[PDB]
């Protein structure tokens, strides 16, 4: 959850 | 009586008291209070991480148990928003704090 949450928001600052 | 409360605590001992209801939702707790018990006895001192990161990755673990509570997803539930610059750190208390 927390994981995924930070996952997406570094995939989504990376992108 | 298991204390009703764990530590977690994030750099020159800024220590955020969780409750146990909550604590448990870590198994990582879990297994620290009952491994390392000598040491690690409901306290978790990432004393290098920062207590405004500390704070988030604990707040995690406090709306998930509000939503548990809540059980039907949702009752004032907020958007767990994560700045980037909280992402950086809080991945590594995130790990540490394992759900």
Redesign the interface.
Do not use: A, G, I, Q
């Given at each position: 959850?927390?994981?995924e949450?930070?996952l997406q928001?570094?995939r989504?600052?990376v992108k | 009586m298991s204390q009703d409360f764990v530590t977690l605590v994030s750099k020159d001992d800024k220590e955020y008291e969780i409750s146990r209801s909550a604590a448990m939702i870590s198994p990582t707790l879990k297994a620290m209070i009952e491994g390392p018990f000598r040491e690690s006895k409901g306290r978790i001192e990432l004393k290098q991480f920062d207590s405004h990161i500390l704070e988030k990755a604990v707040e995690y673990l406090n709306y998930n148990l509000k939503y548990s509570g809540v059980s039907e997803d949702d009752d004032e539930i907020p958007e767990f928003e994560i700045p980037t610059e909280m992402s950086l750190e809080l991945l590594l208390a995130a790990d540490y704090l394992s759900i």
């Open positions: 959850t927390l994981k949450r930070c928001v570094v989504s600052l | -």
